[PDB]
Amino acid sequence: STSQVRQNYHQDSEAAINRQINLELYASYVYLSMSYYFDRDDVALKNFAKYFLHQSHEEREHAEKLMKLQNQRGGRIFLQDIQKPDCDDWESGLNAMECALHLEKNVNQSLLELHKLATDKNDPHLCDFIETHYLNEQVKAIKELGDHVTNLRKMGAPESGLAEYLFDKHTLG
Amino acid sequence: STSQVRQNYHQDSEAAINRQINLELYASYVYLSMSYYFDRDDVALKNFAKYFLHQSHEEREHAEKLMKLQNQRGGRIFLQDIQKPDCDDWESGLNAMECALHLEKNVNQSLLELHKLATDKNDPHLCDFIETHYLNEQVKAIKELGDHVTNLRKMGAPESGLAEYLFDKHTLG
Amino acid sequence: STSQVRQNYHQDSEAAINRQINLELYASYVYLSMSYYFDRDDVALKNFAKYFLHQSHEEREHAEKLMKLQNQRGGRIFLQDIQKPDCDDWESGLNAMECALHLEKNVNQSLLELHKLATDKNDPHLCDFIETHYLNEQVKAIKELGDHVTNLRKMGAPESGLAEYLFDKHTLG
Amino acid sequence: STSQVRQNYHQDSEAAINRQINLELYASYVYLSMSYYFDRDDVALKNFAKYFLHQSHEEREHAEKLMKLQNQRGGRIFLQDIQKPDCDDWESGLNAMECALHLEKNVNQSLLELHKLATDKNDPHLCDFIETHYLNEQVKAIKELGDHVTNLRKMGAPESGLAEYLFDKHTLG
Amino acid sequence: STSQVRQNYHQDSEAAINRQINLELYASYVYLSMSYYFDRDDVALKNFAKYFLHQSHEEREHAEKLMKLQNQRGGRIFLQDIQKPDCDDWESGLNAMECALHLEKNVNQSLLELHKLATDKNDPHLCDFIETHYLNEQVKAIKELGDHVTNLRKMGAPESGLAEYLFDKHTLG
Amino acid sequence: STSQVRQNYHQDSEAAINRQINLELYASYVYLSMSYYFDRDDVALKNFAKYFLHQSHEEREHAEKLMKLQNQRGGRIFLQDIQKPDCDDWESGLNAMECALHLEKNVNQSLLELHKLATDKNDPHLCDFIETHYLNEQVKAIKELGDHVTNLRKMGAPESGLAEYLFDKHTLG
Ligand code: NA
Ligand code: NA
Ligand code: NA
Ligand code: NA
Ligand code: NA
Ligand code: NA
Ligand code: NA
Ligand code: NA
Ligand code: NA
């Protein structure tokens, strides 16, 4: 049953990739939830909605790239349920950005664990894949979200609806 | 707590839309699974893979349009877990097409039930939405899949790997 | 006699690069042999011929990049005889693809050993060079060849000359 | 006081980045000094001047990229004095190229130490940053300078003013 | 040892130009520090960052033009250490603009002293150089910074983070 | 076992073509070695490197054309080991050009022997092939190399590094 392509690809690595696929799909779902919260008539921040929808689609692309990797290496994809997000109502633009920052840091932590595994199993291809495609993307995402949180807080969010309105227009627009 | 926009939108309809969102997301996931099956080194049918990936992305778009509808009408989106697909290994191009046909008919049945609900609740906007955006799309999908199944069977699939190869090239390519 | 440019470049690494140069040149020669087998009047599969000739030229480019590296680091190139390929007659399209897959996996194994050496000698430049220019290229090559082998086998090669003919036209053309 | 973005970023790494910033700024200053030496009326080698000025600007860009990294990771930039270069009068084109080669090797050594630190602290993002943006750039620079030194020496510099003149025109022009 | 080009160029003028070179390089460094303060995740004012980075690069250009002058006149460049800026943390957009205004006025004062020296040494070329390339540039810079400080203060900075946010967007963007 | 295409193609001719293939591949390897000698940091003559690399690629093309001929005529290609070049270090531009001239004359001698064989076996197609594709190419190559050797010697190579430098720039550049 060993794939004809498989070489230097540990079972533990294969399993970790399947976990990471699920995590990326979960993140995609979280961002989708956030997006549509901002589309509510009682929230009505269109550029927040757009921002999170973009992030949702990006996370899905990340998942798909891991699926591609799994097959490239001769591993086998095993999908799991995609858990629903932790919240239905994301409260405010600031709260959503803070939740996104937390999520991104969680995803980054997983990726760092995956890199450590790859290095421990002497799988340089896998380690390089993670470095090249995932780790700087995460650092950039985290920095961007932190910047957003800073600005929102400085402007007076979430108490000031004017703050979120103007941030939506000037930063996210 | 009633939305300022809400008018003529029954709680039962709102609940049915939330169920349909989940079903579309599930369908998207099924098609994603199928796609990546065909990308395996031991399957290696790239145009089958492409076909199913396209379908996956289309189902996600369908889900998002329902989410948009929910907010347009002043309903509230409640997401649920996305169940994993029924299979990890889809066996053959023919078997996957047959499974897709079954799925599409299941989705269509739900949509017909949703239309009946809308009509029973005297919600012409919702009924029209389903007719306009979903019902002909489903009929077309079902007809296309049936055509594919017919052709594959006539060509000798799944016993003939030459059949699937040539169908991949000439129909799906 | 130490080069003015040399820094952090171990003698063992230098020797391993010279071995890898020879291996790449050998691979180039193998693919050249395969190419011209398919150009025989009694074989006559032009797209197989083209495929392997392309691979031959690619392997030569890989060798030359290693030669460039050797000089960049202040090592010294020592060339060795290029051994003739193991076969004169490659039997069939399927057999050649299987032999190519075996070759590519052998080249990949060497590269993985080179990476391990670089990591053991704390030579991050060399390790990065191998990761960046060689390891994903090999994974991709291996996956492609595996896909080709799968398809040929499914279509009925090598017993079916129709299979190889059609694969030549539709996949390799 | 821990930055909201900070993750997997050791204090030792942060300190090493601040040192590297200073070193790059120092290198920039050295090259600036060299440039303007060649602009003297009693030296008058315009393409040497241009070469070194370009290098000065490149080193500044390198410093700025490290500053960007520091902030991306949630470290804090601490600037130090930029020491004056070791010479005011660089003697000859050959002598300046030799001094540049020595400088570049010193910068490379620091970078290799930084990479080793990153690897020791299990900071793959930082290690990858150094590999991707700094290590091949340094190898290339070192090789180029070595080539220049070789050519100048072979041509008869610094005893032959004709050598430097012609090198300025044909190599650096 | 007198340069073949030197004419009407006093030793005191030569020394004053070397001091001005250092001051311009210092100013460049100050602005660089400011720039990267605004790039911090906990500050996050991108257009402030851009503004100061531009100023940094401009001051470097000013230094280089003085170096060119020194050589044009047959003086000799003597570089000194570039002192680190007075602050690591610039507190606020308003505080940085105020510090910039103070710096620019200090640079202007030096330039006025240089002009007076040139006039006292009957060096019309040098006096004209300073007038043509430096004095109106400084007046313009000072006026611009004063305008910025005025606006920030009127808008409610630094107490209002909304003020700095909006100034960043509308004035500096 | 006689090829269906074979006509008027003597076994001795077939064997001679296989020998010529090996010789062309050998020549290609020699030129590759020379190329990379000139790329060394302690040699650093980029246009010599380029010249020889071009020649390497040309010889490979010559080999491939003979392989094509062999199959066109219904002969069978039998590859042999490619011997390593006689030198690792080619000493100087002049020495390499002299070695190239010697090589080209050796290749020409073989080709003349092949032509004589073809004429003796009354194989006008083969004789014409050699005349049309190989003999004038060799005469031109030999004349060019002789011209290069003459110029290098007249300029003072190899004692004058200025000679090789200038030849590299003006003739080979
Ligand atoms: Na992701
Ligand atoms: Na890497
Ligand atoms: Na659907
Ligand atoms: Na209708
Ligand atoms: Na290769
Ligand atoms: Na640098
Ligand atoms: Na200035
Ligand atoms: Na030839
Ligand atoms: Na003729």
From Swiss-Prot, chains A, B, C, D, E, F:
**Mind listing the UniProt keywords for this protein, alphabetically?**
Acetylation, Cytoplasm, Cytoplasmic vesicle, Iron, Iron storage, Lysosome, Metal-binding, Neurodegeneration, Oxidoreductase, Phosphoprotein
Provide the disulphide bond pattern. Answer: none
Domain Ferritin-like diiron residues, every copy: 7-156
Example GO molecular function:
ferroxidase activity
Where is Fe cation 1 annotated to bind? Answer: 24, 59, 62
Q: Where in the cell is it found?
A: Cytoplasm; Lysosome; Cytoplasmic vesicle, Autophagosome
Which effect does the record note for changing residue 19 to A? Abrogates interaction with NCOA4. Fails to localize to punctate lysosomal structures
* SUPFAM superfamilies noted in UniProt: Ferritin-like
Instruction: Note whether Iron occurs among the keywords.
Output: yes
According to the UniProt entry, what is the EC number of this protein?
1.16.3.1
Q: Which InterPro entries match?
A: Ferritin, Ferritin-like, Ferritin-like_diiron, Ferritin-like_SF, Ferritin_CS, Ferritin_DPS_dom
This chain's protein is named Ferritin heavy chain
Main site of residence? cytoplasm
| Outcome when changing residue 24 to A | Reduces iron binding and oxidation rate
Under catalytic activity, the entry for this protein gives: 4 Fe(2+) + O2 + 4 H(+) = 4 Fe(3+) + 2 H2O
The record names the disease as:
Hemochromatosis 5: A disorder of iron metabolism characterized by iron overload. Excess iron is deposited in a variety of organs leading to their failure, and resulting in serious illnesses including cirrhosis, hepatomas, diabetes, cardiomyopathy, arthritis, and hypogonadotropic hypogonadism. Severe effects of the disease usually do not appear until after decades of progressive iron loading.
**Organism this protein belongs to:** Homo sapiens (Human)
Instruction: Quote the Gene3D superfamilies the UniProt record gives.
Output: 1.20.1260.10
Q: Where is this site: Essential for association with cargo receptor NCOA4?
A: 19
GO BP annotations, alphabetical order: immune response; intracellular iron ion homeostasis; iron ion transport; negative regulation of cell population proliferation; negative regulation of ferroptosis; negative regulation of fibroblast proliferation
What task does this protein carry out? Stores iron in a soluble, non-toxic, readily available form. Important for iron homeostasis. Has ferroxidase activity. Iron is taken up in the ferrous form and deposited as ferric hydroxides after oxidation. Also plays a role in delivery of iron to cells. Mediates iron uptake in capsule cells of the developing kidney. Delivery to lysosomes is mediated by the cargo receptor NCOA4 for autophagic degradation and release of iron.
Q: Which amino acid positions bind Fe cation 2, per UniProt? A: 59, 104, 138
**Assembly with partners or alone:** Oligomer of 24 subunits. There are two types of subunits: L (light) chain and H (heavy) chain. The major chain can be light or heavy, depending on the species and tissue type. In the human liver, the heavy chain is predominant. The functional molecule forms a roughly spherical shell with a diameter of 12 nm and contains a central cavity into which the insoluble mineral iron core is deposited. Interacts with NCOA4; NCOA4 promotes targeting of the iron-binding ferritin complex to autolysosomes following starvation or iron depletion.
